[PDB]
Amino acid sequence: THTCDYAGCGKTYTKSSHLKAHLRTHTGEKPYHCDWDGCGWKFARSDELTRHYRKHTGHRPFQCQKCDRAFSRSDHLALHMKRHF
DNA sequence: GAGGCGTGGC
DNA sequence: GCCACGCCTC
Ligand SMILES: [Zn+2]
Ligand SMILES: [Zn+2]
Ligand SMILES: [Zn+2]
């Protein structure tokens, strides 16, 4: 339904916002800026900025309930959990 | 773990 | 558009 019309691409998406995010791969647009003092990094996706900030802060919101390990991402925790079983 | 990215409820 | 699931590849 939503087609990339940049050059020879033609990739397709189910939401306008997915296509808009995809277009940044062609334009080099990076609207999400880190505001950490002195940093300067910018990203094409908001969740990429979120991941980046967790590098700055070392915040690990996803705590394993079966051992002491914690993670910055739910998918990391999920894979780790499989190791307990 | 980290980077890239498709995706759908809101 | 945000957020955050979660898959693929390294
Ligand atoms: Zn494209
Ligand atoms: Zn930064
Ligand atoms: Zn554990």
Q: Which of residues 22-51 of A touch strand B (CB under 7 A)?
A: 22, 25, 44-45, 47-48, 51
How distant, in Å, are the alpha carbons of A22, A51, A54 from that of A81? 32, 21, 21
Task: Quote the CA–CA distance of A80 and A85 in Å, as a whole number.
Answer: 10
What spacing in Å lies between the alpha carbon of A49 and ligand 1's midpoint? 22
Task: Quote the CA–CA distance of A39 and A58 in Å, as a whole number.
Answer: 16
Q: Is the CB of A14 under 7 A from strand B?
A: yes
Q: Can you tell me whether residue A18 is helix, strand or coil?
A: helix
On whether the CB atoms of residues A44 and A26 are closer than 8 A, the answer is no
Q: Is the CB of A11 under 7 A from strand B?
A: yes
Q: Can you tell me whether residue A80 is helix, strand or coil?
A: helix
